[PDB]
Structure formats: C-alpha cells, structure tokens
C-alpha cells in the first residue's frame, strides 16, 4: 500500500476581515450634516 499524507491548506484572511471592519468604521463616520 501507500503512505497517505494530507497536507491541508489553511485559510488566512484575518487581514482582509480586519481591513473590512476598518472600512465599516470609517464609513458611517461619514455623515454629512448641514445648515445653522
């Protein structure tokens, strides 16, 4: 028989998750008020 090996990739999108959270915070702090 054969020597089973797995070698599974692991997903790393922590930066994208965190950068998208920062976008959602920088927007929504972009309200535009007016007048007097």
């Amino acid at each position: 028989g054969k020597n089973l090996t797995a070698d599974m990739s692991k997903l790393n999108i922590s930066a994208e998750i965190q950068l998208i959270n920062e976008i959602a915070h920088n927007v929504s702090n972009m309200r535009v008020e007016v007048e007097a």
């Binding site: 028989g1 089973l4 599974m8 990739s9 997903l11 999108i13 998750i17 929504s28 535009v32 007016v34």
Partner: protein, 72 residues
Amino acid sequence: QNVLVDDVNKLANGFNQLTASVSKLALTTSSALQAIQAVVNQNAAQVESLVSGITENFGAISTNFKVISQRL
C-alpha cells in the same frame, strides 16, 4: 435657484443613507468571511486528524499480516 437648496438636502440624506448601508454591507461581509474561515480551517484540521488515525490503522493491519505470515 430655489431647488438648489432642496437638492442639497436630498443629496445629504441620500449620502447618509448610502454610507449607513455601505457600512452594513462591509460588516455583513466581514461576518460571512469570519464564519467561512472558521469552518474551512476546522474541516481541514479534522481531515488531518483523520489521516493520522487512518495511518495508525493501516500500520496495525500491516503488523497483523506480518505476524501471521511468519507465524504460519
């Protein structure tokens, strides 16, 4: 030159609406991405753990054939 003032009002509210929902869009996308990462990585870990177990079994099976083939 009277509609200008109303038009500035309309753009103002539409802009604040758009930003609020772009905000929501980003957060909801972030939330989906986080769940995907957790599940994909856990499913990978299981397969790895599974192959280790399958390898122990094949070793024990190989040992049994050798014990019985020479003890015969």
